[PDB]
Symmetry: D3
Subunit: 153 residues, 6 copies
């Protein structure tokens, strides 16, 4: 259904390198609907929990330190297939494997400085959204372009 949601974050390198607007533009251009947006400074414990599935991996310590080293921009986007589609926009995890046209393909080199995050499944997206956003920070609204973007609307 077009009401699917995903969590996207500009990581601290993406904020530092002035990629916030560019990343948001790509999601707006695609037809996805912005329903949550904030600038925040993750704590180490927040980073640990966000990446909890990766706790045994050797990059985890550095990942958690880096993710909490400076501000991120957290977002919630709504749209048909937006979890998968958000990942398509981001490009492959390792920028070396990402193609031009994607965020990581255009703007990143190193897997540890890969500028952005996106939820990897509908289930993890729900968890991430719930973790980073309060219900008061999510806005219910209708895009005036909804019938131009979706057939069934």
């Amino acid at each position: 259904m077009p009401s699917e949601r995903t969590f996207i974050a500009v990581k601290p390198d993406g904020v530092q390198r002035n990629l916030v607007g560019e990343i948001i533009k790509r999601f707006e251009n695609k037809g996805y609907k912005l329903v949550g947006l904030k600038l925040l400074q993750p704590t180490e414990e927040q980073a640990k929990q966000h990446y909890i599935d990766l706790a045994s991996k050797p990059f985890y310590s550095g990942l958690v330190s880096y993710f909490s080293s400076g501000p991120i921009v957290g977002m919630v986007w709504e749209g048909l297939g937006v979890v998968k589609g958000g990942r398509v926009l981001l490009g492959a995890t390792n920028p070396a494997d990402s193609l031009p046209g994607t965020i990581r393909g255009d703007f990143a080199v190193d897997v540890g400085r890969n500028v952005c995050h996106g939820s990897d499944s509908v289930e993890s997206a729900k968890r991430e959204i719930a973790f980073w956003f309060k219900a008061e920070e999510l806005v219910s609204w209708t895009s005036h372009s909804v019938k131009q973007i979706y057939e069934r609307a």
Copy 2:
């Protein structure tokens, strides 16, 4: 041969969502030559004929209604391999399958709101060009850049 031609249309969602300029720019940037251009309101019967091969498909009635719901921009582009190359610029029919960099990859979500059309073969292109354009509507001209774009020119 560099004189190959194809029919590209901005569908009514593409016009509504202000993608006419962006789509033309992509074709110009590639090196293709614009030889026909018009804004028109297809009739339902024109839409039925344009998509006649698809008459048995479950989506046909909706396709034909939508395509005739408002203005399209019809184009004829000329260049080496332009039929296939135009379709590559458009991206996969279903935008969920389209890659970033392409028109559908960058701007569309839903297969029924996929912003554009391109002819699928040399012979269908000839048919579509003849259906939408009278002989006197095409403009033959030489790009000042033809020898920078083509080795053989």
Copy 3:
């Protein structure tokens, strides 16, 4: 009134230099509505008439020859203040006087190769639209975005 209309043309240098998409994009981005569009080859006599007020000027013969030397893209745009606003988007007649941000400011050098034309008043626009377009060539439609662009809509 938001139903005001103007005639804009991409002149033959603008077509040759692949500025058609870029010019249309600027008008779409502004909120103006495309209601007429075609590619055509003006005749010398059409060019003489289009610029008839300038018949005594030293540049007229060159202007009329050039304007009829290859294809133009003719457009009719609709929107509040579109005659004046279209000219603002174009920039100063002589590109040496045009500011960055405008079409001439960004893309042109020479007053005789200034890439585009726009009607200079409401009444000249009506004349130019009638000269270049038959009634049946215009397309009336409602932008899905009209109430986001205009308070009164």
Copy 4:
């Protein structure tokens, strides 16, 4: 360089997919984002934000529209950012705004003019205080600060 301003993408700007474009322009200029939120103003927030226009005949419509859907509120930091932000936005009436500015490139009607920016250092301080809690601002150092400023 620690001057701050409040910039909002108005509901028309959100609806018309200009959030990223607007943020990009401010990032490109060298300004630093220190606050960002998406919210739908209440009627009362809309009345207060525009409190100096309460006696104008366009007020109730401005209030209703500003509270009709989400805005994006921003706090930007930088040398001369109050004046600079308004230069990026362009003239209040898009008819008067020049290409290159946000209103010049994207808006037609004064009542649907896409964005807001504080008009002075003091009004910025008041708008920031109105729209953001203390804990919602983020203090950080751009790694590019010495490239943007001589005195850093």
Copy 5:
């Protein structure tokens, strides 16, 4: 005459902030012709001589130190009125006074970090070009678009 030339430099901040391509694009888009291009590290003495007219000004010391602190990209552009036109593209000296659409209007804040330089007169342009470029580094060529950009060509 269209053979006028000017010296443009991306200053060390402009190089550091990844504005080389953007600056070159703006000059290419305008119709100006690139006839010299190099990356170099100015010496302090080179910076002193380049800015010799400003030797008594209180910012001079800091200007010369900064200009020689890292690489610049030096360019020579050719075109009708290119000295004045290059300055128009750059925008006002102090970015606070520069308008959006210009290089300094779009990308700079501080007069001491104003990302680029352009010659201020035909005479100073000749001096600057001669100072920064050897004759072997200037390329004589003809743009295939010269007749599309200039009437008299």
Copy 6:
């Protein structure tokens, strides 16, 4: 991260006003420009640069065209930049290149394919040595190096 590659805008790319666009793509990616020059290759330079194609039937035409007008030669530095540069360029035949790449967005014909990039670390070292004198390369530290690389 100290890997280097040679990228050239070919004479068609210069003529078609793609120099800035190409440089922008490499800067945006995070790669560092350490050499840059505009020059018109001699016939002999064109023959040598393409020496591994000397037995091909398209050679003399490639040589004549490559020496017909100015190119822009570049040296870029960064992790995996040889492979990365070629990914940015796209497939050799623009018919096979995808949108988003330089050839995918801007070229049609294999003989007018806008740009060149070294095919390997060793060929890059040889191309760099051929096109640039030692004194023409500039060593410098991007202020953004720690934002682009974890190990910096």
